[PDB]
């Protein structure tokens, strides 16, 4: 395991560098400018050297070639001596190019990774959306009567948002109220009139009640003392209508 | 002399205590490691199957099951991965800091598809965070069932087991301490798997035992927790909008799909793909200093690493909900934070660039852009206030009401097109409400002359406009400042000069009487139907701007008290009122009425200009004086 | 009917940036003390730039934005909205002649594209007497020809810290203030004075808080000996 | 059947890498570890000196030096603590996870005074983060000068050194990897020792080489660790003089603290603490999101972690202090606590003790005036947030009231002066003292002689909306609907009579001025102004609504929706409304009256702290009346 490569990375836009007297924006555009300048400068140094070394080894070659030509010739190896001296110190200067060519590599080593060098974009694709029921767990959230239990219990599902769950609470409160036990009907109808409470209060937000579910239930940590305020009275008051609906319903079994 | 060389050795007993206690911050991660390791085993056996389907003969399916057992306080994770041979059990599990996975990968041919999770070879021992006695029963091909057992001591025992054949795979049985019994209930489990390791490739099927025995229900019930496949790994151009949407709903429980979706990837030393969604509606608690700052969750090789680090995306882009996933990052030993943070900074740069692109792309669907903008406009202005670089590219995303555009915002460019060949500036007025600025005193001259204006009616605006100095080489000027020079004819200029010659005295003595409030008073140029108005000094705070600051709750009180704003009063020379006023003045100086009238109209103008009077009581009393007179009390 | 809305949002501070110094200078002139203060602001900024290695060869009064505090002292900010080392120093020397209302010499005199470009000797217009003697000596020493004798940014900023915030006593003079790290707390005590001595501008406190911290004895002692030598008239 | 027992073994190679690379997050910590270890060494020999003087015979200095040599890229930390004998060198430094320090501590008698920094045993190896080769040269009594030397590979070499004897002690030499030469310069070093380990007991003396060639500073000692840890000393033995010095040293400040708390808890959690309140608020408080706390946690005198939000609830930024414990479950990197709930217990104890410093400070009226006028915002903020301390927070409040001029008074001074029938506290929220002082609403009360409270700060509403009660006497704003103040029955029947007289006037005014007000009714709180506007009981108040709309980042929908319902009251004895009822009952639907009603309604809305939607209409009406009076 080794992390050495990630050690040196350099980013123009850094929050830490800012000083109260220097404007952030111009500082960033200065730093970025300096980085771009330095990287292109090192690259230009590298390319200019890449030429120099190549053309000096080329000189090594031409010296060889024409010295070989004179090597074959008669009596001209005095020119061999002189140009062999030229070529030997030329070869050392070529090894100097090599030396700084290796330094080029060392600079590349020290070249701190920046946003461009580190990564090159591969692919990209954007899309724009252009587009325009569990009754027994309703009975369970109902049985609870502590709308924390029922809150996360119906936050179990996306279906709670659908009008259909609200429509079913109507069904279940109605037919429960004539199940020969009045208690459980209001032990859920607290949820029903809380449904309508948050319905018109999220309409006082004009937001879909579905959104305001979590907004209301855990509104504040105290949550209006589990919302002790106004839930019973209003629910027995809605239980009036639920009783009418239920009683007519039981007549139809 | 003599140099003696010795090799490093380790005190196993203390070393293991170190590993158990000091490494992992949170105790619940242990479930992640066992799961991850089991996933590695699955990948090994699956790879082996491809070359030789003979290997998968022992067992077809590849699943991971968690079987909590409350009665005996044992939580067992069963996987059907390659198991461990006897030698492997002793070597891999037995030696600290050795990871079989790393070996399998290195041996494997280069470029192999399989990418396995763990490499450190120390993660497994974390199970002792919540267990005293761990028991591993494994059975692998070419070997018999064997059962490693250890109690976190220096010793581990390997015995050939003779129990029910488990087939290919590993069963790891934990025995929970008296404390940390919390892990047994399915609630905590389900939660944890949802938090970390939700997107591992294989089906995690919990086996909880519920007894009804009344139609008995849920004797044992497999609730496959890991449900949604990771999408971002799939290639684009294969993902319809609907599929992307399902992921959004799952990622963030929401009843309605996303609004727009970006999806891209970068290859390089930093390799990382990404999903970015913009929600259809803003959340209720955005900008409520809620604990959550960013919603994007970082992933590595698919295990949730870390979230909500501020560095990921700047604050103005907080709404973007997304999943970033890479294949290799310098990771802290606990696997809960990057080693060095500058990698996160490169990530941030790439993100904001792509996101801003997603936006300017959305500008096409005028309808969708209307929805998105009226929803998250604040964030864009905030960015203008903060992001230094993207400021320019941010600007175009703006949209405003203007004098011309009616009940339809327009960009800044559309206004740049409709410039009158001499505008040289953009005219904007900041206020509280559209109608009010619309009927304001300042704009009247322009609307007469036909120059267009912009209604910036939001508190957040000033924060933006104060830095949005220029745009497309055409600058911005507020109408409520001292100069307001608009293109005119020379005859108009000499006429205005004549006005000044006529009214120079009137300004003088009004300055005299109405002292200690206004620096100076001068014949106006921007008024055509109202007697007078107040503009602030060029450099000083505009009236509206001041109003905003005095209101901010956590303002520095002392500075606000020290603060004062210079006022300059302009008078409209052709108005009948000021005309008769110059008459009464040049007629007689120091008349009582002209004094009181002047105070009255200055007060009412200060009221109309948006500035608020220091004490309304004097003004109200002056009004009452007048009413009484009319009523002939 | 009784729903709630008492959340507390994030607080954002607003900064008017109405003008560039050239302007604010023609419209208003500052008191000598506040002028020394803004000169200190510039020195600090230029140093910080020198540290990051980015050197804006060109600094002109049009570049420096002025943040008018509301009914409050101007806060200077360097910027490049208008398109080696020690050059910035020479530039800031010239910005100064202006702050005190003396129009820039070299903007018209000559040799401004390079401080190395030799201006005519001593033609520098003598500063008005409203400036304290030490600041005067400072700008003269700063606008001197050679970068060799030219003191670096940090030296100058420390000189100003000494003179303005620090005590103005004889120990302070004539190099009686023997450098010490303990003396750094003595410098704070020296800075205890001037906290309320001229409290007409709030910036004094601000700068005191934001710069007094990173004060380094070595540069401080160099600044001290230079401060004495002038005042000493040795 | 047969059970084969083996023993855990470790891949030393991989383990070593894990430690150097993955374990420690910030590279600069290596300086902390080497220093801490040397401190331990120092503590050992001091202890050993106690029993026998002979042990300290070699040298008595007990100091630490750090000589950076740029010339050869070697940073060497030299100490005078008990060194290590060969055996120890091989065993301690060699074997991973073996802590000689731990062994020494265990061996000591239970009541031993010494407290030694580390026990984990993996620390020394951190040096390799910045060093290719770590050469340790140590000489300890009972052995000859040795020289350990390793290159982070699988091996280490130990060899008797024959160099200059360094007496007793230990000297660890580093060779820095080229890429990390930054640590060599005096600046980075000095910065580091201050941030981590500036409170270790012994003297740290840096040796930087300078040439003044005249020539000077060839080797200058700069003792970095200078301020001594105070909190360890006994409280009550420290005068308010030194407390200040430590403060200025802790937080660079030119002046001293304002008040200082100092205490210690010895339970399951043993921790001491210092808490200071600064004289002047930091100019950037509440403006920087990054810095939330100023207290710095310490464990056994080394800086662990700071600025963790959990330590103190955010409305205590101004508090500047230091917390130090002797033992905490610490992450291996020694940069964060393993259990975070410990921080919670710490927070509770802290806030309790701090709220004490404050209610204690309430005695020095003068000092309390200074402190309160400085950090009042924070207290109200706490009232807004802290649920429990809300009650105990309240008393720290101070307000202007009708009866007190230029002298803030607590809520209690007002509870005492409550006339027998008050049953409530009367407060009015506004924007400036004078304005609320001359307001329309208060006039009745001031006539009846009751006292009222001027809450003139934007932050107030956030507080008062939750500060429902106080000492069983509630609060009521004067700008609400039902301001019911104690009265006589004759006054009541007279008011009833007023209603009988004016019932029609309210009706037709409601008619003409329709849909701007919900109801108009004869007033009870006015005595010299014709009319005023109070909001509905449940809805928002006037300026509360104003402040909210003026907030920079606010949900537009919610802000508009939760709003005031306006009710206009009329003062029945005023001459204006009297003549108005005359003109009305005389003739209905007269032009004049219509406009009059809307004119005075506008001016009252203006004087009620509300802002008219469009000033232009009102200004034009004013101009019309001006032209009329001026006969134009
Ligand atoms: N369920 C399993 N099935 C097969 N092999 C396993 C299982 N769990 C662990 N191992 C083996 O035991 C080794 C212990 O490695 P571990 O401590 O988990 O670190 P890592 O997370 O790097 O794998 C693993 O490398 C793997 O080879
Ligand atoms: N400078 C020193 N002088 C003497 N003994 C030392 C020195 N540094 C380390 N040691 C010994 O070598 C052991 C190495 O321990 P280390 O890795 O530092 O872990 P710890 O921080 O727990 O001591 C220490 O327990 C200590 O006994």
PDB file of N, CA and C in Angstrom, chain A residues 25-66:
ATOM      1  N   UNK A  25     -11.257  37.221  -5.551  1.00  0.00           N
ATOM      2  CA  UNK A  25     -11.396  36.910  -6.966  1.00  0.00           C
ATOM      3  C   UNK A  25     -10.099  37.155  -7.714  1.00  0.00           C
ATOM      4  N   UNK A  26      -9.550  38.359  -7.596  1.00  0.00           N
ATOM      5  CA  UNK A  26      -8.329  38.657  -8.326  1.00  0.00           C
ATOM      6  C   UNK A  26      -7.186  37.787  -7.850  1.00  0.00           C
ATOM      7  N   UNK A  27      -7.208  37.390  -6.582  1.00  0.00           N
ATOM      8  CA  UNK A  27      -6.191  36.468  -6.103  1.00  0.00           C
ATOM      9  C   UNK A  27      -6.286  35.139  -6.830  1.00  0.00           C
ATOM     10  N   UNK A  28      -7.493  34.596  -6.935  1.00  0.00           N
ATOM     11  CA  UNK A  28      -7.661  33.325  -7.617  1.00  0.00           C
ATOM     12  C   UNK A  28      -7.246  33.436  -9.064  1.00  0.00           C
ATOM     13  N   UNK A  29      -7.616  34.499  -9.733  1.00  0.00           N
ATOM     14  CA  UNK A  29      -7.325  34.567 -11.140  1.00  0.00           C
ATOM     15  C   UNK A  29      -5.899  34.882 -11.309  1.00  0.00           C
ATOM     16  N   UNK A  30      -5.217  35.211 -10.232  1.00  0.00           N
ATOM     17  CA  UNK A  30      -3.793  35.429 -10.358  1.00  0.00           C
ATOM     18  C   UNK A  30      -3.115  34.102 -10.188  1.00  0.00           C
ATOM     19  N   UNK A  31      -3.515  33.362  -9.173  1.00  0.00           N
ATOM     20  CA  UNK A  31      -2.927  32.055  -8.914  1.00  0.00           C
ATOM     21  C   UNK A  31      -3.109  31.134 -10.102  1.00  0.00           C
ATOM     22  N   UNK A  32      -4.328  31.058 -10.621  1.00  0.00           N
ATOM     23  CA  UNK A  32      -4.576  30.238 -11.793  1.00  0.00           C
ATOM     24  C   UNK A  32      -3.685  30.666 -12.938  1.00  0.00           C
ATOM     25  N   UNK A  33      -3.560  31.971 -13.140  1.00  0.00           N
ATOM     26  CA  UNK A  33      -2.692  32.473 -14.184  1.00  0.00           C
ATOM     27  C   UNK A  33      -1.268  32.010 -13.967  1.00  0.00           C
ATOM     28  N   UNK A  34      -0.790  32.089 -12.732  1.00  0.00           N
ATOM     29  CA  UNK A  34       0.580  31.689 -12.459  1.00  0.00           C
ATOM     30  C   UNK A  34       0.774  30.209 -12.723  1.00  0.00           C
ATOM     31  N   UNK A  35      -0.202  29.388 -12.347  1.00  0.00           N
ATOM     32  CA  UNK A  35      -0.078  27.954 -12.586  1.00  0.00           C
ATOM     33  C   UNK A  35      -0.042  27.659 -14.071  1.00  0.00           C
ATOM     34  N   UNK A  36      -0.983  28.229 -14.819  1.00  0.00           N
ATOM     35  CA  UNK A  36      -1.005  28.006 -16.257  1.00  0.00           C
ATOM     36  C   UNK A  36       0.314  28.435 -16.864  1.00  0.00           C
ATOM     37  N   UNK A  37       0.786  29.616 -16.483  1.00  0.00           N
ATOM     38  CA  UNK A  37       2.055  30.105 -16.990  1.00  0.00           C
ATOM     39  C   UNK A  37       3.169  29.127 -16.680  1.00  0.00           C
ATOM     40  N   UNK A  38       3.249  28.672 -15.437  1.00  0.00           N
ATOM     41  CA  UNK A  38       4.371  27.831 -15.046  1.00  0.00           C
ATOM     42  C   UNK A  38       4.324  26.492 -15.756  1.00  0.00           C
ATOM     43  N   UNK A  39       3.136  25.909 -15.883  1.00  0.00           N
ATOM     44  CA  UNK A  39       3.051  24.603 -16.520  1.00  0.00           C
ATOM     45  C   UNK A  39       3.375  24.708 -17.997  1.00  0.00           C
ATOM     46  N   UNK A  40       2.855  25.733 -18.673  1.00  0.00           N
ATOM     47  CA  UNK A  40       3.220  25.909 -20.069  1.00  0.00           C
ATOM     48  C   UNK A  40       4.687  26.270 -20.202  1.00  0.00           C
ATOM     49  N   UNK A  41       5.247  26.949 -19.207  1.00  0.00           N
ATOM     50  CA  UNK A  41       6.653  27.307 -19.252  1.00  0.00           C
ATOM     51  C   UNK A  41       7.519  26.069 -19.149  1.00  0.00           C
ATOM     52  N   UNK A  42       7.185  25.187 -18.215  1.00  0.00           N
ATOM     53  CA  UNK A  42       7.920  23.938 -18.086  1.00  0.00           C
ATOM     54  C   UNK A  42       7.743  23.074 -19.320  1.00  0.00           C
ATOM     55  N   UNK A  43       6.551  23.087 -19.914  1.00  0.00           N
ATOM     56  CA  UNK A  43       6.338  22.307 -21.127  1.00  0.00           C
ATOM     57  C   UNK A  43       7.139  22.878 -22.289  1.00  0.00           C
ATOM     58  N   UNK A  44       7.196  24.203 -22.392  1.00  0.00           N
ATOM     59  CA  UNK A  44       8.009  24.821 -23.429  1.00  0.00           C
ATOM     60  C   UNK A  44       9.483  24.534 -23.194  1.00  0.00           C
ATOM     61  N   UNK A  45       9.890  24.520 -21.933  1.00  0.00           N
ATOM     62  CA  UNK A  45      11.269  24.185 -21.625  1.00  0.00           C
ATOM     63  C   UNK A  45      11.483  22.759 -22.089  1.00  0.00           C
ATOM     64  N   UNK A  46      10.536  21.884 -21.773  1.00  0.00           N
ATOM     65  CA  UNK A  46      10.689  20.483 -22.134  1.00  0.00           C
ATOM     66  C   UNK A  46      10.755  20.278 -23.640  1.00  0.00           C
ATOM     67  N   UNK A  47       9.861  20.921 -24.385  1.00  0.00           N
ATOM     68  CA  UNK A  47       9.888  20.806 -25.843  1.00  0.00           C
ATOM     69  C   UNK A  47      11.130  21.424 -26.485  1.00  0.00           C
ATOM     70  N   UNK A  48      11.568  22.577 -25.984  1.00  0.00           N
ATOM     71  CA  UNK A  48      12.776  23.188 -26.522  1.00  0.00           C
ATOM     72  C   UNK A  48      13.978  22.294 -26.273  1.00  0.00           C
ATOM     73  N   UNK A  49      14.009  21.660 -25.111  1.00  0.00           N
ATOM     74  CA  UNK A  49      15.099  20.746 -24.825  1.00  0.00           C
ATOM     75  C   UNK A  49      14.972  19.511 -25.667  1.00  0.00           C
ATOM     76  N   UNK A  50      13.744  19.044 -25.852  1.00  0.00           N
ATOM     77  CA  UNK A  50      13.484  17.857 -26.664  1.00  0.00           C
ATOM     78  C   UNK A  50      14.014  18.071 -28.057  1.00  0.00           C
ATOM     79  N   UNK A  51      14.037  19.320 -28.507  1.00  0.00           N
ATOM     80  CA  UNK A  51      14.605  19.596 -29.770  1.00  0.00           C
ATOM     81  C   UNK A  51      16.095  19.617 -29.618  1.00  0.00           C
ATOM     82  N   UNK A  52      16.601  20.326 -28.609  1.00  0.00           N
ATOM     83  CA  UNK A  52      18.035  20.534 -28.542  1.00  0.00           C
ATOM     84  C   UNK A  52      18.799  19.227 -28.474  1.00  0.00           C
ATOM     85  N   UNK A  53      18.399  18.343 -27.560  1.00  0.00           N
ATOM     86  CA  UNK A  53      19.016  17.021 -27.458  1.00  0.00           C
ATOM     87  C   UNK A  53      18.944  16.255 -28.777  1.00  0.00           C
ATOM     88  N   UNK A  54      17.769  16.236 -29.403  1.00  0.00           N
ATOM     89  CA  UNK A  54      17.614  15.512 -30.657  1.00  0.00           C
ATOM     90  C   UNK A  54      18.575  16.033 -31.715  1.00  0.00           C
ATOM     91  N   UNK A  55      18.615  17.353 -31.916  1.00  0.00           N
ATOM     92  CA  UNK A  55      19.507  17.904 -32.933  1.00  0.00           C
ATOM     93  C   UNK A  55      20.981  17.816 -32.528  1.00  0.00           C
ATOM     94  N   UNK A  56      21.288  17.644 -31.241  1.00  0.00           N
ATOM     95  CA  UNK A  56      22.703  17.466 -30.911  1.00  0.00           C
ATOM     96  C   UNK A  56      23.168  16.027 -31.124  1.00  0.00           C
ATOM     97  N   UNK A  57      22.270  15.071 -30.893  1.00  0.00           N
ATOM     98  CA  UNK A  57      22.588  13.676 -31.168  1.00  0.00           C
ATOM     99  C   UNK A  57      22.610  13.554 -32.674  1.00  0.00           C
ATOM    100  N   UNK A  58      21.819  14.381 -33.352  1.00  0.00           N
ATOM    101  CA  UNK A  58      21.852  14.389 -34.810  1.00  0.00           C
ATOM    102  C   UNK A  58      23.222  14.853 -35.253  1.00  0.00           C
ATOM    103  N   UNK A  59      23.762  15.857 -34.573  1.00  0.00           N
ATOM    104  CA  UNK A  59      25.100  16.323 -34.897  1.00  0.00           C
ATOM    105  C   UNK A  59      26.092  15.204 -34.646  1.00  0.00           C
ATOM    106  N   UNK A  60      25.918  14.467 -33.551  1.00  0.00           N
ATOM    107  CA  UNK A  60      26.785  13.323 -33.290  1.00  0.00           C
ATOM    108  C   UNK A  60      26.747  12.431 -34.517  1.00  0.00           C
ATOM    109  N   UNK A  61      25.550  12.201 -35.057  1.00  0.00           N
ATOM    110  CA  UNK A  61      25.441  11.318 -36.190  1.00  0.00           C
ATOM    111  C   UNK A  61      26.191  11.884 -37.381  1.00  0.00           C
ATOM    112  N   UNK A  62      25.924  13.131 -37.750  1.00  0.00           N
ATOM    113  CA  UNK A  62      26.546  13.689 -38.950  1.00  0.00           C
ATOM    114  C   UNK A  62      28.064  13.686 -38.844  1.00  0.00           C
ATOM    115  N   UNK A  63      28.596  14.016 -37.663  1.00  0.00           N
ATOM    116  CA  UNK A  63      30.032  13.898 -37.439  1.00  0.00           C
ATOM    117  C   UNK A  63      30.506  12.483 -37.740  1.00  0.00           C
ATOM    118  N   UNK A  64      29.876  11.491 -37.101  1.00  0.00           N
ATOM    119  CA  UNK A  64      30.152  10.094 -37.423  1.00  0.00           C
ATOM    120  C   UNK A  64      30.143   9.859 -38.930  1.00  0.00           C
ATOM    121  N   UNK A  65      29.048  10.225 -39.599  1.00  0.00           N
ATOM    122  CA  UNK A  65      28.856   9.863 -41.000  1.00  0.00           C
ATOM    123  C   UNK A  65      29.954  10.443 -41.885  1.00  0.00           C
ATOM    124  N   UNK A  66      30.156  11.756 -41.796  1.00  0.00           N
ATOM    125  CA  UNK A  66      31.215  12.407 -42.569  1.00  0.00           C
ATOM    126  C   UNK A  66      32.637  12.056 -42.129  1.00  0.00           C
TER     127      UNK A  66
END
